[PDB]
């Protein structure tokens, strides 16, 4: 009977290995699920008996070859495999000599120290359960288990990597029932995976000193070229944080050469050149990144990939999408002042996003980033600083033509805080307006500044009383974005009052913006220049002393950009006079 | 259906995405949506489906999420809903579409896929906004959101042409329950010069056992006793 | 070079570009970096010499061209530096002095350096230890 059970285990392992080496995307997973049902049925047949000693090292090799092929297909461990380990462990406990896995392991390793001749299978089971606890982020008790496997007098060795190095596999694995992987093949994987995760964690928590050690450890030994890339990239990051640029570059070069997947190196390249101020190459690198992200097999075995965590957003290994990136380029292009470049980039962003109905989805920048209407604004601010103002209007019009159904009906206009309009509307009227300044139309300019101002005061943007949809958390609610957007349109309109020669009305709007946002100084500049034109002394000095008494947190980009656009260079010169 | 005794076995060649753990799935144009049970977390995915008449393939999965919100007889259910301008799903009206999902999906002209969950939670996700990779995992807290929690499981989701005065642009959104809370939803734009949603948690009879929609705000549903209709129009 | 096996591969790359034996470039760059250097001077140097030890272990260092370039510098070079070159087995003091053209110039420089040294030994004991050691060598 155990002849037949072992022949079956061997048969299904040979099937699985044939599938891993050969086949196609279907036939692979077909033969894998065949073998998986086989191992399931055989496990149930073996678990039916009240196990003997000679049935036990077959049952554990089948348990391990079942959990292996389980996690290989699922592309992840789970708690069903923990309960399978528990089943096989209570089966080892009830043969000779219940509560939970930690004490079960302690007792089972005490029983293994009685030398039943299955320790080649026990070390493999420790490999799988250590891997489960590793993917489940249960590093503390893992140390306890491997500490119990080795001497208990090495209990002061809290560090997992020394402890895993000391953990020997026990035998050369003589003719037992066949297996998919050996315990040392699992040990190598455990080492690199644990080292890598510790190093990455140390990096994100700002110890890129300690990180080098752990990551060089991931490099030395079993490291698929794909993981080698990510190691070197993390090193780029660490050296870049230190201050050492050239070593950083070195690692990145190696990553590019070895890699078929060079998203992340160039992102670090970008952040690197950003530290130096090598603006030109920065934008060059991001242009390469775009083209790179244009271009696009799973083994029935436990490789390292399986045990690596998903990168965070804080990591150097988070690389967005083409769309999410091209947005990086244009945003970072636009804080420099390459409006022309910026503009191209933005149109290409917007082309991708809207025109995609037919191809694969190219998505928006995620909701830690700006919201999709904040992107149409960034497009427009770029287009104005180009001087493409007939385009900066086919933007603001397209936008409010799609979202009309949303916009407030402004019948509160007749009935005159209570109604609701989100800051991106009031802002589309701001930039629709400044586009008419570039074109030369005083009338429709002052129109649009007034319409912006009416939806700033005779509506509230913060009516999150009713969670009615999906919505902009960040960029549109900030009390910052309110007080500075008020100031913006008040000055924007004040300049058109100055153009017409109605400098009393201009004084009214400038005086209001001073009460509004006293930490702009663009406001105080325009006001004080008007007072210096008309009635300087007492008013001006009263505001001077205020400024010196007074003496950017999270402003949205299209607004920061707009302020930097309108502000005069001869600002401080005038303010010290 | 061409398909080169009147019984026919399928060969496993006809298998595509042998995911094995998949409970629900729906269809858009050129895009395929599954929704797959795992540990605690259920994950919606999104694959291609080859637009050329080739070998019938999945493609590469475009993206994946975890419906973190759900931790587990009743299968959950999937309905897509495209907005006006842009197929076996439903179209809503621009007012509504903007009302439920927000500007983003309006601006993208992005289909939005409603999952009904055994919990009774009725969750939408914007599809555009779900394209990820190994480098780039989807955050569910961002990316999946939750309309309204019927306390009981879901049976049938649709939408209706109230005020009817093949592609009809509907103005109301329909759920149903097992025990028989319905929830139809509407655009109002009323009493504050501002758009508000019109919720209506009715209470029908019994176990509800299926549903459908017929022309003109008429929902053909079934209890254990009887096949009964409701009018909203 | 002012900042290991990576740095070896970098010099290999430069050598493949310029069609030079890696030894000449390594020695030249090392000598120019020593001239740049001339406490934490000592630590930077120690690390540079560990890397030069790697270069010599991998036979990627021409000692004779190194001596030649060192006698091209001849002005920035302190006695401490050249004693550390000697003690780390990088260059023998013998091979150095038997690779300069002007033997008289070498003599005069050593005279100056040792005359300064024997005053320097009366500054503090911790400097005087290192001074006494290299003086005895
Ligand atoms: Zn926003």
UniProtKB/Swiss-Prot annotation, chain A:
One of its GO terms (cellular component) is cytosol. Changing residue 519 to R: No effect on HES1-, nor FANCA-binding. Gene3D superfamilies: Tetratricopeptide repeat domain. InterPro entries: FANCG, TPR-like_helical_dom_sf, TPR_rpt. Highly expressed in testis and thymus. Found in lymphoblasts. It is linked to Fanconi anemia complementation group G: A disorder affecting all bone marrow elements and resulting in anemia, leukopenia and thrombopenia. It is associated with cardiac, renal and limb malformations, dermal pigmentary changes, and a predisposition to the development of malignancies. At the cellular level it is associated with hypersensitivity to DNA-damaging agents, chromosomal instability (increased chromosome breakage) and defective DNA repair. This is Fanconi anemia group G protein. It comes from Homo sapiens. The gene is FANCG.
Curated annotation (Swiss-Prot), chain B:
Plays a role in Fanconi anemia-associated DNA damage response network. Regulates FANCD2 monoubiquitination and the stability of the FA core complex. Induces chromosomal instability as well as hypersensitivity to DNA cross-linking agents, when repressed. The chain holds residues 90 to 372 of 881 of the full protein. Belongs to the multisubunit FA complex composed of FANCA, FANCB, FANCC, FANCE, FANCF, FANCG, FANCL/PHF9, FANCM, FAAP24 and FAAP100. Forms a subcomplex with FANCB and FANCL. This is Fanconi anemia core complex-associated protein 100. It comes from Homo sapiens. It is found in: Nucleus.
Swiss-Prot record, chain C:
Phosphorylation is required for the formation of the nuclear complex. Not phosphorylated in cells derived from groups A, B, C, E, F, G, and H. It is found in: Nucleus; Cytoplasm. It is linked to Fanconi anemia, complementation group A: A disorder affecting all bone marrow elements and resulting in anemia, leukopenia and thrombopenia. It is associated with cardiac, renal and limb malformations, dermal pigmentary changes, and a predisposition to the development of malignancies. At the cellular level it is associated with hypersensitivity to DNA-damaging agents, chromosomal instability (increased chromosome breakage) and defective DNA repair. DNA repair protein that may operate in a postreplication repair or a cell cycle checkpoint function. May be involved in interstrand DNA cross-link repair and in the maintenance of normal chromosome stability. Belongs to the multisubunit FA complex composed of FANCA, FANCB, FANCC, FANCE, FANCF, FANCG, FANCL/PHF9 and FANCM. The complex is not found in FA patients. In complex with FANCF, FANCG and FANCL, but not with FANCC, nor FANCE, interacts with HES1; this interaction may be essential for the stability and nuclear localization of FA core complex proteins. The complex with FANCC and FANCG may also include EIF2AK2 and HSP70. Interacts with FAAP20/C1orf86; interaction is direct. This is Fanconi anemia group A protein. It comes from Homo sapiens (Human). The chain holds residues 61 to 237 of 1455 of the full protein.
């Amino acid at each position: 009977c155990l002849d037949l059970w072992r022949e079956k285990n061997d048969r299904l392992v040979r099937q699985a290995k044939v599938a891993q080496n050969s086949g196609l995307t279907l036939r692979r997973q077909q033969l894998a699920q065949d073998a998986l049902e086989g191992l399931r049925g055989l496990l149930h047949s073996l678990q039916g008996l009240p196990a003997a000693v000679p049935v036990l090292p077959l049952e554990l090799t089948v348990t391990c070859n079942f959990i292996i092929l389980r996690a290989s297909l699922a592309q992840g461990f789970t708690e069903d495999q923990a309960q399978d380990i528990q089943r096989s462990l209570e089966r080892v406990l009830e043969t000779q000599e219940e509560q939970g896995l930690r004490e079960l392991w302690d007792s089972v390793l005490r029983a293994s120290c009685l030398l039943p001749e299955l320790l080649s299978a026990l070390h493999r089971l420790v490999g799988l359960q250590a891997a489960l606890w590793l993917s489940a982020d249960r590093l503390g008790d893992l140390a306890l288990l491997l500490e119990t496997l080795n001497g208990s007098q090495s209990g002061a060795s809290k560090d997992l990597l020394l402890l895993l190095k000391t953990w020997s596999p026990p035998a050369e694995e003589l003719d037992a029932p066949l297996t998919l992987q050996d315990a040392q093949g699992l040990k190598d994987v455990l080492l690199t995976a644990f080292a890598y995760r510790q190093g990455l964690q140390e990096l994100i928590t700002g110890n890129p000193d300690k990180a080098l050690s752990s990551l060089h450890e991931a490099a030395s030994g079993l490291c698929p070229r794909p993981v080698l890339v990510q190691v070197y990239t993390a090193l780029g990051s660490c050296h870049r944080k230190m201050g050492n640029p050239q070593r950083a570059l070195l690692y990145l070069v190696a990553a590019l050469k070895e890699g078929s997947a060079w998203g992340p190196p160039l992102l670090e390249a970008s952040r690197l050149y950003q530290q130096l101020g090598d603006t030109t190459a920065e934008l060059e690198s991001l242009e390469l990144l775009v083209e790179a992200l244009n271009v696009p097999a799973p083994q029935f075995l436990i490789e390292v990939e399986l045990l690596l965590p998903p990168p965070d957003l804080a990591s150097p290994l988070h690389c967005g999408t083409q769309s999410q990136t091209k947005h990086i380029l244009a945003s970072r292009c636009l804080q420099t002042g390459r409006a022309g470049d910026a503009a191209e980039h933005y149109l290409d962003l917007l082309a991708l996003l809207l025109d995609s109905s037919e191809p694969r989805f190219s998505p928006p920048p995620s909701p830690p980033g700006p919201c999709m209407p904040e992107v149409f604004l960034e497009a427009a601010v770029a287009l104005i600083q180009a001087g493409r103002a007939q385009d900066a209007l086919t933007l603001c019009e397209e936008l409010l033509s799609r979202t009309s159904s949303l916009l407030p009906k402004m019948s509160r206009l007749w009935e005159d805080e209570l109604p609701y309009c989100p800051l991106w509307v009031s802002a589309t009227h701001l930039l629709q307006g400044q586009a008419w300044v570039q074109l030369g139309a005083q009338k429709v300019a002052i129109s649009e500044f007034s319409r912006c101002l009416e939806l700033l005061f005779r509506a509230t943007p913060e009516e999150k009383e009713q969670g009615a949809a999906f919505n902009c958390e960040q960029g549109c609610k900030s009390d910052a974005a309110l007080q500075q957007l008020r100031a913006a349109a008040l000055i924007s309109r004040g300049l058109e009052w100055v153009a017409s020669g109605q400098d009393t009305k201009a004084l009214q709007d400038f005086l209001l913006s001073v009460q509004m946002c006293p930490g702009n100084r663009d406001t105080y500049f325009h006001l004080l220049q008007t007072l210096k034109r008309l009635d300087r002394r007492d008013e001006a000095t009263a505001l001077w002393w205020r400024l010196e008494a007074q003496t950017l947190w999270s402003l949205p980009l299209y607004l920061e950009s707009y302020l930097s656009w309108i502000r005069p260079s001869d600002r401080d010169a005038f303010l010290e006079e | 259906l061409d398909h080169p005794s009147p019984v026919i076995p399928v060969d496993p060649d006809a298998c595509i995405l042998p995911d094995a753990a998949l409970c629900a799935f729906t269809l858009l144009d050129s895009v395929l949506v599954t929704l797959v049970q795992g540990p605690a977390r259920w994950k919606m995915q999104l694959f291609e489906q080859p637009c050329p008449g080739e070998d019938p393939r999945p493609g590469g999965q475009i993206g994946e999420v975890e419906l973190s919100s759900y931790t587990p007889h009743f299968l959950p259910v999937l309905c897509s809903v495209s907005p006006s301008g842009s197929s076996g799903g439903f179209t809503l009206e621009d007012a509504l579409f903007g009302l439920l999902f927000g500007a983003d999906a309006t601006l993208l002209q992005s289909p939005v896929v409603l999952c009904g969950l055994p919990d009774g939670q009725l969750c939408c996700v914007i599809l555009k906004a779900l394209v990820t990779s190994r480098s780039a995992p989807g955050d569910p807290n961002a990316l999946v959101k939750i309309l309204h929690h019927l306390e009981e499981p879901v049976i049938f989701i649709g939408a209706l042409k109230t005020e009817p005065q093949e592609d009809v642009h509907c103005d109301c959104l329909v759920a149903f329950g097992h025990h028989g809370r319905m929830l139809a939803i509407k655009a109002s734009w009323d009493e504050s010069g501002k758009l508000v949603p019109e919720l209506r948690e009715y209470c029908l009879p019994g176990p509800v056992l299926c549903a459908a929609c017929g022309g003109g705000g008429r929902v053909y549903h079934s209890t254990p006793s009887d096949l009964c209709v409701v009018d909203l129009s | 070079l002012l900042e290991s096996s990576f740095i070896g591969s970098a010099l290999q790359d430069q050598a493949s570009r310029l069609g030079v034996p890696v030894g000449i470039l390594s020695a030249g760059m090392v000598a120019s970096s020593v001239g740049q250097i001339c406490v934490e001077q000592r630590k930077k140097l120690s690390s540079l010499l560990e890397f030069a030890q790697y270069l010599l272990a991998h036979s990627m260092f021409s000692r004779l061209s190194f001596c030649q370039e060192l006698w091209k510098i001849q002005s920035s070079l302190l006695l401490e530096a050249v004693w550390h070159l000697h003690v780390q087995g990088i260059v023998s003091l013998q091979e150095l002095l038997e690779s300069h053209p002007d033997m008289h110039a070498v003599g005069s420089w050593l005279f100056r350096n040792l005359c300064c040294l024997c005053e320097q030994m009366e500054a503090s004991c911790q400097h005087a230890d290192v001074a006494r050691a290299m003086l005895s060598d």
